[PDB]
């Protein structure tokens, strides 16, 4: 892995980079993002810097200085694009920075693209519903859970993850305690349904904004196809023509399996991994 | 600012960076923490943290502690500590899964110096609000993957509900569940004192919260006294007809709650009492 600092350095090989007082390791406190290098370009940064600036605005860190930023996504993309044309797997850590100082953590990473993620766009998984612990009205009743920020504090998320993996499932997605359709803990949910209209959660849920899914949604109202916001039941995703668990990195991953019902595949499936290529490249 | 220990035992130099980019705690906060207080030359209760740390890390799926090292590794930090000043010490264990593909995960001890709102505290006592959390009564059993009862590294939603509430000039908070429960607080465990006669109580510890070690030495040295400990099922009801509301931790050893929502609560002479019963816990292991 590569990593780059917005200070400018370019980081030493097997040197260490954070202090033992970084409230990123000590509390898990600050944001992040992650993005996919791919065809010597990191895509839909803009839209990334802007969920980035919303969850630092959630998290009552200082506005993030966009201009370094991007100075610091370039170099690390570049020198990821220079040694391979392989994909690469894009990170901003922007954390609190340590106890008592006066200056947040912010730096780059660029690492290889999992073997899993491979598998998941070209197979998909299998995913389990697991409840969330929230109530879909949570979200509004109670802000100070700041459901909506795209934090550092991913502990539950991979606790969730090694626990559907034990039971042979490769994702989870998460439901409310009153049974709506929430999020997975790495990735927005979309629905195919027929009049082929598409569909996802509604934001004020306790979830986050999907970046992906939302220029999906660009790119297939361009398309022809009917996208909206809806509160969806367990119901629906069984009745649906597809589901998908839509991220940055992993981009599409059907679910052909979920909860032990095997689920058919539908035309739509093959488009809908088309369109989800076109909507990474659609800021080009 | 802060002295580092490594399990191996060696002392890190005071500035320089010690964990990669790619740690698992710092990119994912994934991993499990415990919070000692450094007190007249040595950690307070060693053993019961060391024993809930082991707790978390089977909960977070973590390699069992080499708990020899870790033993070792606190004494290191604590005579570093009280040779360097007679003043309490705040000594934390890290215990991360390490970097993202490799084989051994990250682990040292820091002492720092206490931060001044617990002076604070401990003598004036604190305000504080009651929030909803979101979880049931019965969320710790029925739900293990949300791993509630696990001390981890991600703290973020913890800091976030003490600044909306600070914002609201509030002090601290008392987390209420959906069906209307007293659960916790964000980095504390609470304790009230009532009537059956002066009874110390706490929440059911088979809810979906973390168990207190000094909560726990309390309520041996409390009983030792005389007085009446049970988990009990606490409505916010019950907390305005107490007699104290005490926010208790590892570090801010207790807080009273002096005002509630806005509504001052009144003080009675087993506040005063508590003060020195937490005292006397501490230490009942030395």
């Known amino acids: 892995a590569m990593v780059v600092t917005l200070d400018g350095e370019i980081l030493q090989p097997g040197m260490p980079l954070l202090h033992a007082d970084d409230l990123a390791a000590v509390r898990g406190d600050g944001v992040f993002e992650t993005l996919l290098v791919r065809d010597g370009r990191a895509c839909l940064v803009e839209a990334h810097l802007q969920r980035l600036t919303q969850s630092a605005r959630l998290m009552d860190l200082p506005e993030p200085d966009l201009p370094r930023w991007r100075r610091a996504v370039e170099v690390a993309t570049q020198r990821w ?5 392989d994909e690469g797997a894009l990170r901003l850590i922007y954390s ?132 909206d916001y809806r509160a969806l039941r367990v119901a629906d995703l069984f009745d649906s023509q597809g589901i998908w668990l839509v991220s940055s990195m992993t981009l599409a991953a059907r679910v052909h399996t979920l909860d032990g019902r095997r689920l058919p595949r539908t035309p739509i499936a093959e488009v809908f991994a088309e369109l989800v290529d076109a909507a990474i490249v659609s800021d080009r």
């Open 81 to 85: 694009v220079a040694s391979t044309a």
């Open 96 to 227: 609190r920075g340590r106890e008592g100082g006066s200056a947040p953590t912010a730096y780059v990473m660029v690492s290889p693209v999992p073997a899993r993620v491979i598998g998941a766009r070209r197979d998909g998984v299998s995913a389990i519903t697991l409840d969330r612990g929230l109530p879909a009205d949570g979200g509004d009743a109670m802000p100070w859970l700041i459901a909506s920020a795209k934090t550092l504090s991913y502990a539950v998320n991979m606790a969730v993850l090694r626990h559907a993996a034990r039971q042979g499932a490769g994702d989870v997605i998460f439901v409310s305690t009153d049974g709506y359709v929430l999020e997975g803990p790495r990735s927005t949910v979309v629905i195919a349904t027929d009049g082929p209209c598409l569909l996802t959660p509604p934001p004020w849920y306790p979830i986050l904004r999907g970046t992906t899914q939302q220029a999906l949604f660009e790119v297939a109202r361009a398309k022809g196809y009917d996208c």
